[PDB]
Design a protein around this ligand. Sequence first.
Ligand SMILES: CCCCCCCCCCCCCCCCCC(=O)OC[C@H](COP(=O)([O-])OCC[N+](C)(C)C)OC(=O)CCCCCCCCCCCCCCCCC
Ligand SMILES: CCCCCCCCCCCCCCCCCC(=O)OC[C@H](COP(=O)(O)OCCN)OC(=O)CCCCCCCCCCCCCCCCC
Ligand SMILES: CCCCCCCCCCCCCCCCCC(=O)OC[C@H](COP(=O)(O)OCCN)OC(=O)CCCCCCCCCCCCCCCCC
Ligand SMILES: CCCCCCCCCCCCCCCCCC(=O)OC[C@H](COP(=O)(O)OCCN)OC(=O)CCCCCCCCCCCCCCCCC
Ligand SMILES: CCCCCCCCCCCCO[C@@H]1O[C@H](CO)[C@@H](O[C@H]2O[C@H](CO)[C@@H](O)[C@H](O)[C@H]2O)[C@H](O)[C@H]1O
Ligand SMILES: CCCCCCCCCCCCO[C@@H]1O[C@H](CO)[C@@H](O[C@H]2O[C@H](CO)[C@@H](O)[C@H](O)[C@H]2O)[C@H](O)[C@H]1O
Ligand SMILES: CCCCCCCCCCCCO[C@@H]1O[C@H](CO)[C@@H](O[C@H]2O[C@H](CO)[C@@H](O)[C@H](O)[C@H]2O)[C@H](O)[C@H]1O
Ligand SMILES: CCCCCCCCCCCCO[C@@H]1O[C@H](CO)[C@@H](O[C@H]2O[C@H](CO)[C@@H](O)[C@H](O)[C@H]2O)[C@H](O)[C@H]1O
Ligand SMILES: N=C(N)NC(=N)NCCc1ccc(I)c(Cl)c1
Lengths: 48, 113, 174, 171, 98, 140, 115, 83, 97, 347
Amino acid sequence: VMKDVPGWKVGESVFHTTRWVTPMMGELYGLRASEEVLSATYGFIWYT
Amino acid sequence: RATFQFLPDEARSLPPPKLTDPRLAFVGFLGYCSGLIDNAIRRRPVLLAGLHRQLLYITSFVFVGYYLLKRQDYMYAVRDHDMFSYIKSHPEDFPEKDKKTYGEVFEEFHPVR
Amino acid sequence: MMLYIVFILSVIFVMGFVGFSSKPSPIYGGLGLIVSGGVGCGIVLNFGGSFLGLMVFLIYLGGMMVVFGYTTAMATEQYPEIWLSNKAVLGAFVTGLLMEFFMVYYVLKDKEVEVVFEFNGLGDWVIYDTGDSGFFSEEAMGIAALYSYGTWLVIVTGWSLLIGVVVIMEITRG
Amino acid sequence: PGIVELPSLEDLKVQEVKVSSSVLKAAAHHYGAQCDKPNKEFMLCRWEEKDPRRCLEEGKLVNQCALEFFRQIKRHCAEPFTEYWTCIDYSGLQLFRRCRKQQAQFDECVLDKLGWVRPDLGDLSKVTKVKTDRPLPENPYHSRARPEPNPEVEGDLKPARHGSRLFFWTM
Amino acid sequence: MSMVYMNIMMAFTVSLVGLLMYRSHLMSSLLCLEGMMLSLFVMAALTILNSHFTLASMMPIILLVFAACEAALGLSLLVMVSNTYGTDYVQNLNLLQC
Amino acid sequence: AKTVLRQYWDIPEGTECHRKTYATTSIGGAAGLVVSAYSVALKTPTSFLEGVARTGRYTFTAAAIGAIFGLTSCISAQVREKPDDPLNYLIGGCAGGLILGARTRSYGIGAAACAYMGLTAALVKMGQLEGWQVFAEPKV
Amino acid sequence: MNLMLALLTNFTLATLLVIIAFWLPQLNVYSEKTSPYECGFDPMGSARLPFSMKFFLVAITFLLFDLEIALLLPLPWASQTANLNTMLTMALFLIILLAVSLAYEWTQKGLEWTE
Amino acid sequence: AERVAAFLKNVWAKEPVLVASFAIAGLAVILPTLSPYTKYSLMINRATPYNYPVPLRDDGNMPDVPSHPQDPQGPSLEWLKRL
Amino acid sequence: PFFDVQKRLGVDLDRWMTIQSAEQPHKIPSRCHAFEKEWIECAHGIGSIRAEKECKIEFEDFRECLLRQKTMKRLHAIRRQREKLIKEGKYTPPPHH
Amino acid sequence: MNPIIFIIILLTIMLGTIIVMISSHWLLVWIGFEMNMLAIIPIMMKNHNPRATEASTKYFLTQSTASMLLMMAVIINLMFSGQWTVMKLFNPMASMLMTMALAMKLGMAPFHFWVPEVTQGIPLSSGLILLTWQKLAPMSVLYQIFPSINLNLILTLSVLSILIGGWGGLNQTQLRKIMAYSSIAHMGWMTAVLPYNPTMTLLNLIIYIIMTSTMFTMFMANSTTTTLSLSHTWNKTPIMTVLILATLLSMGGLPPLSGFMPKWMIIQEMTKNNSIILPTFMAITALLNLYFYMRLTYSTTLTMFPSTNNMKMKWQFPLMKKMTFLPTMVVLSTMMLPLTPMLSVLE
Ligand SMILES: CCCCCCCCCCCCCCCCCC(=O)OC[C@H](COP(=O)([O-])OCC[N+](C)(C)C)OC(=O)CCCCCCCCCCCCCCCCC
Ligand SMILES: CCCCCCCCCCCCCCCCCC(=O)OC[C@H](COP(=O)(O)OCCN)OC(=O)CCCCCCCCCCCCCCCCC
Ligand SMILES: CCCCCCCCCCCCCCCCCC(=O)OC[C@H](COP(=O)(O)OCCN)OC(=O)CCCCCCCCCCCCCCCCC
Ligand SMILES: CCCCCCCCCCCCCCCCCC(=O)OC[C@H](COP(=O)(O)OCCN)OC(=O)CCCCCCCCCCCCCCCCC
Ligand SMILES: CCCCCCCCCCCCO[C@@H]1O[C@H](CO)[C@@H](O[C@H]2O[C@H](CO)[C@@H](O)[C@H](O)[C@H]2O)[C@H](O)[C@H]1O
Ligand SMILES: CCCCCCCCCCCCO[C@@H]1O[C@H](CO)[C@@H](O[C@H]2O[C@H](CO)[C@@H](O)[C@H](O)[C@H]2O)[C@H](O)[C@H]1O
Ligand SMILES: CCCCCCCCCCCCO[C@@H]1O[C@H](CO)[C@@H](O[C@H]2O[C@H](CO)[C@@H](O)[C@H](O)[C@H]2O)[C@H](O)[C@H]1O
Ligand SMILES: CCCCCCCCCCCCO[C@@H]1O[C@H](CO)[C@@H](O[C@H]2O[C@H](CO)[C@@H](O)[C@H](O)[C@H]2O)[C@H](O)[C@H]1O
Ligand SMILES: N=C(N)NC(=N)NCCc1ccc(I)c(Cl)c1
């Protein structure tokens, strides 16, 4: 998707530290169908 | 230095204020003035009335004042101790200058005519 | 669309605030505050705070009922003002709605907006945590700790509530 | 700030334990007894390393021991086990207390055909020790060097030189 | 920030402007004070819940406790204003200009 | 105010006088609007129109003082060919004070304003030249 | 989604019944029919006139007491703590202070309605 | 005692509801200190494992830590089963 | 605190809830626990004047974790590029998206 | 009010202030302010009259508004730092809100309008608490957050407070309003030096409280609340007119009296930071305070105003008021200058 973008470096961190950081929902399900995003975010709260 | 302490233990390496300290005498004089004002506002004989009350005014002023002066002296010792230790730790910021005599230093003369 | 549930509730939240901030009759201001309390409960629930969300709704429902009683006694007039009945009230109402409509329209157009401060508009779900499978409600554990960690909090709140009773008795004894 | 190093999809490939939670729950007490060693080695790794990418090989051995554990049940106690986890599966809460008869049949089967003893109440929640070769990570947080402390001020506390020195005061 | 914070911060500002722009009824303004507390509760609750700051979960509860003490205090003064003047109008409270 | 203030001090004395009058007039207008907002809020006008009349009267008066000052002080610098002299701000300052007396119809306010506006403006140029600080940064 | 659907259905059903109630029957509207009810005679004064609240002090006390239950409702969860010595003491302290506050308002005649 | 006893019989006649309240609240405050089973409440609360028991790195000198959950070492709940 | 009676008396009135990396019930960690721990240890003892510059990297990471402002800026770009390519027809998502 | 109830409410006023001063957590600071606000309102209403009702209502609305802004600042600070420790704030918008909130609680200009009215509407004893004890909590918070305070904002508040306090006092004949506008002016000196040396803020605060307490106690002794009723004091307790004169001269900052010490030290700390224009402006503006202090001395001690016949009946009874600590306070209010280096105890 970002191949043609001039300055982009694919996979770059936003953190200076190299330590592992747990991804937030937007990173993990960034490019997935809303149905699975909806299940992963609000599935538990909305279950009965 | 010590958190929320009036007289940190390091302050005992300093000499205490003498009981004849001129500042302590002034504080005692203030206690005496407070005693006289106490008599005056209550329309009692100012000099004579209630000498026990006047004594406690003097003694309580001196008592508190002794510890304030002890803490005052301590805090200025700490200021000096901090400042000199900092000068030792940063010599390059406090260079010792080369001193020139007035025979060498040029100063302009401004006539008063 | 359901992914924006928190945003939609927050829009209604603001609409209720415009409702009682324009200050119609306090009867209707109370209604605006009750709607905001409900959707505000809905918002906090969608972040995992079922107890906090329900509690704030429960507290404000009791509060506005007492306000309703005091309104009929101490803040009523012959012609209580709805939003449409007063030019000042209507102007505040429409001004607030228009500002809200514009912030919503643009933040949903650019998936972002700059209203003084930069707000992302990707849907509030992006910031959620990804990995949890504990056998307990974390919010419940934090609230329950009031009685083991928050001894000092218990004392000052307990005292404040007792003094509150003492104080209102003094204030209202003319 | 640097690219995140992710394992390739072909380093994440392991045979999966594709059974349902009711199946896992029915076997959990014997599973915890039999597969303690690889399981406690994976968890010591995860907590020490604080990185899923540093524990993949340990995680793969957890999967293998689990498949071996279920193969043993399949070969010997397949029918008593199916009855048991079918009973657990009916319950909406997957309650142990509703299936003590089917659990008894399963427990005596694995006790006879395999000498498996069910752990007693409290056993599986013990904190245990585990031996390993993998060394203790040095800088798990990837911490930088801490800033140097401010120099200590030390020495003999002496009276202030000429007192307060505030304007004209001589004390 | 996330888009929810836009609407909650907007709600606090709306109530703050509501509080600072009095009309006549003192009760209308006391309502704006309760609204300000509602927006703080929601904004505090969201931040604490999102970050999994477990012990802070009680903080919003404590906020409501002192919101009620504030509300009860406001109503007590409204009663006394009402008794003195027969209305809760704020323009009656102008004796202290002189 | 920070940006409108920089504009004024960033365009040299005597160079682009028209631009200078834009900045000082802009400052004066902003000051007049602030005065109007507090005045209208604390002494309610009898009617909406009267509030607008009072605002436009203060904002224009304040902008006129800013306009005459920024122009006259620039013209003085240009004509005298001395862009660094505080005296130019004194002449500009006094002229603004005179305009204030004009808009108020009161020679006495005109005279007093000319003196104190003139001296205040002269002090401002000196502080700019010498680096005097009003809100000095903490350093010790 | 189930909760939202259930709420929508309940209030949709109620709203539909009100729509039927207003559009099904034959209406005959005129002034005297819709005038306010006061037992056959015209009301004296508006119903919007102030209606004195004689329990005003109990109502304000309700707000403070209503908030105490918000502090007490977490008690079943707090009982799951290992620090039961502290939790029980603090739990009893809060209830006792509520009881003291009730006793004060009671003895000082705060629960009696204004005459 | 007579003054208090006479005071007790008076409040029973006039305010039996408040007599029961203070009696009930008193037992709440007192009995937990006199009860012999109060100590088990903390023990049961402490024995409930909401968290994973992270193992310790066997350094070669922790003889009182079990290697396996079914080993003798470590806390036991035999006291709880007989409760 | 203006008067540090808590330190002198050795009583913890409120500093148990000051930071999200302090002890929590049942050892539940905050999402940004490690970042807060790293910043707190970097700045410890050296004072705010030094910490404002010598622990800037740690504070920036902690701030990014708290508000994720840079992460959503990145996800916004990728999502904007994708929606551009799709409509132009240049890009097709993989079957698992 | 029952005497025991009054004592419990006073201790709650102090406890709220003390909670603010010992708290390391922003929530407990906010609780302390709320508890303090709760307990002071009954002290304002203690006399139950329409003016006290108006005073308390205006106080509650202002203080409760400021608390909302304070809590907003704390929550913004939490979002941008993830912690509650009482110290510098981590967001400039949080610093503006907290600074405005504390200025509101202090009654600093331009948030000052409530101070003259509330003080006038409550008894002298309640006004004494309002203008002295109630400054401690907001000041203690500023003392800790000042590194993150916007320098232009705090110095703007300080300058406006000195001007408005000085100008406002010129037009007053009521003693309580004179003390209120004096308090506004003195607040300006306290916060002007805060960015440079917070120790000098505490000295000014301590010395201001002593002098303010001394004046309120002397007004209470004679039950005087107007300029004219205070002008009868010479024909009842001549000693009191002299103590009032000395304190008023001291409050004006005249050497060799104590009240000159804070102005002296604040000018020193400001000039050390190359702040010359501001301290000169502040000192000259403070001459307005001296002007309307001097008017009081003229009508109280340095002339003899007309009296009334019924005053003769007062000659036959002694002062019965407690006048607690008054002999000590007046001496400290006037005779402390030779001990100025004692300010190091506040470091
Ligand atoms: C708990 C839920 C319970 C709900 C129960 C619902 C009722 C179930 C029983 C229904 C019976 C049929 C209804 C007849 C009653 C009509 C009222 C009446 O008597 O009027 C006499 C009138 C008589 O009118 P008229 O023309 O002879 O003269 C009246 C005018 N003046 C006074 C001048 C003489 O009948 C009608 O006008 C129309 C009769 C239509 C019958 C069919 C009913 C259709 C209803 C649809 C109306 C459209 C609006 C939508 C409403 C919602 C639709 C459900
Ligand atoms: C060695 C000591 C030198 C003196 C240093 C003075 C420094 C200033 C101290 C100020 C405090 C003064 C004491 C408080 C006033 C009490 C005296 C009074 O109020 O009335 C005078 C009174 C006599 O009148 P009476 O009330 O009838 O009592 C009968 C007692 N025989 O009492 C008397 O009989 C006389 C008591 C003394 C009178 C004091 C007069 C006040 C002086 C104030 C002027 C300011 C001080 C000078 C400034 C420079 C300071 C060094
Ligand atoms: C020490 C180093 C620090 C230096 C700082 C300055 C130190 C002094 C601080 C002063 C503090 C106040 C204490 C002053 C004590 C005043 C004593 C006094 O006033 O005399 C008592 C007398 C009261 O009269 P009475 O009680 O009725 O006795 C019968 C006489 N009629 O009084 C009267 O009868 C007077 C009634 C008429 C009013 C005359 C007013 C003009 C005289 C004022 C003198 C005092 C001025 C003090 C101000 C400071 C001076 C530098
Ligand atoms: C106050 C007296 C002057 C009255 C006129 C007022 C002038 C204006 C006041 C403004 C402040 C200026 C004060 C100037 C003195 C301060 C500078 C100073 O001298 O510091 C040192 C001083 C002790 O002085 P030192 O050189 O050490 O002499 C030792 C002698 N044994 O240590 C000090 O700092 C404290 C000294 C204060 C001076 C008064 C105390 C001297 C002792 C007198 C007490 C009275 C004893 C008699 C009591 C009578 C009781 C009935
Ligand atoms: C009584 C007053 C009520 C006021 C209520 C105010 C509501 C505020 C407006 C909320 C509308 C949000 O609108 C929401 O935006 C996102 C934009 O991606 C849409 O989400 C979209 O995801 C992808 C984007 O590629 C599309 O394939 C999909 O068709 C679409 O659903 C949602 O379908 C839409 O519901
Ligand atoms: C009634 C009297 C009331 C009090 C009067 C007080 C008079 C005070 C005079 C103003 C003090 C100096 O005022 C201020 O000085 C600084 C220098 O330090 C200048 O600062 C300026 O310097 C550079 C160049 O020099 C400019 O490019 C820049 O825009 C600005 O930073 C300001 O442009 C000036 O406004
Ligand atoms: C107006 C202010 C009123 C203040 C009122 C305060 C009332 C407090 C009454 C005492 C209540 C607690 O009484 C105390 O409870 C704890 C349990 O919680 C008991 O504690 C006992 O059981 C617990 C477990 O439950 C063990 O951890 C503990 O080792 C053991 O001693 C104490 O044996 C008992 O003394
Ligand atoms: C910790 C929880 C359990 C403890 C219970 C806590 C609540 C305790 C409430 C104590 C109330 C005591 O104070 C109460 O004051 C009033 C005075 O107006 C007394 O007397 C008055 O009320 C009662 C009933 O209303 C009347 O019968 C009586 O004629 C009247 O004089 C009450 O008989 C007394 O009960
Ligand atoms: N100017 C500041 N804000 N700080 C400050 N007081 N610096 C001066 C340092 C100082 C002064 C007196 C003492 I006694 C001590 Cl120990 C230290």
